[PDB]
A paper describes a structure:
Cytidine monophosphate (CMP) kinase is a member of the nucleoside monophosphate (NMP) kinase family, and plays a crucial role in biosynthesis of nucleoside precursors. In bacteria, [name] catalyses the transfer of a phosphoryl group from ATP to CMP or dCMP. We have elucidated the crystal structure of [name] from [name] and validated the function of the enzyme as a kinase. Yersinia [name] adopts the same overall fold as related CMP kinases and is composed of nine α-helices and seven β-strands connected by loops.
There is one [name] molecule in the crystallographic asymmetric unit, and the solvent content is 48 per cent. Clear density is observed from Met1 through Ala225 with the exception of a 12-residue gap from Glu180 to Ala191. The central portion of the molecule is composed of a central β-sheet, made up from β1, β2, β5, β6 and β7, and α1 and α9. The NMP-binding domain is composed of anti-parallel β-strands (β3 and β4) and helices (α2, α3, α4 and α5). Yersinia [name] can be described as a member of the class of long-NMP kinases owing to the insert found in the NMP-binding domain, which is not present in short variants: in this structure, the insert comprises the anti-parallel β-strands, a loop region that connects β4 to β4, and α5. The lid domain is composed of helices α7 and α8. The ligand-binding site is formed by a pocket on the NMP-binding domain. One sulphate ion is bound at this site. The sulphate ion occupies the same position as that of previously published bacterial [name] structures that have been crystallized in the absence of ATP.
Numbering used by the authors: 1 to 179, 192 to 225
The structure:
Amino acid sequence: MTAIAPVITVDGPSGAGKGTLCKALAESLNWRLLDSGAIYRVLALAALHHQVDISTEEALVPLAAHLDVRFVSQNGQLQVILEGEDVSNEIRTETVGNTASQAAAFPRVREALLRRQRAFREAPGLIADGRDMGTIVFPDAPVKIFLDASSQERAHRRMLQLQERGFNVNFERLLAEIQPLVPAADALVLDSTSMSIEQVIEQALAYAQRILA
């Protein structure tokens, strides 16, 4: 239900400012935060730690279903906590994200993770950051937002990320490399291409706090 535990979903491609919009909404409203991309990686990090069979789906399903994960965000930085440990950096490595795509291939694991993500919906409220948040995870959410951006913009954001991790990147290689996913019919559509991220946040906040209150 809308009051009890409202959900604001934020859907879009990677590299559009979704992460940043969500951390900011979550700290402006003091709400819980679900980061969908990260949850698949935490599951795969949980799978590597407890070193379990990444075929057969039999062991990943209950892991997923009760995954001990929470997302805390203070002062703009995402803190990811698995079974107590801060695993923020651990879930960013390439091996982790390749085992996440391996788990993500079994439907029953996807359905398990879907139920785990719904269970994030609590008081006072949830900011849900993903791809299908407003269309599949929380189709009845009071506030849905779709945050798009051009391939160049997204390429640019990715370049800086890759460079921050240490790789040297070619912008034109990346752009071309980058060059389902749909707004929900009741999504507020924003484009961070020629808009500052502060403008996006302020429009998002104002939009949410006009529906919810």
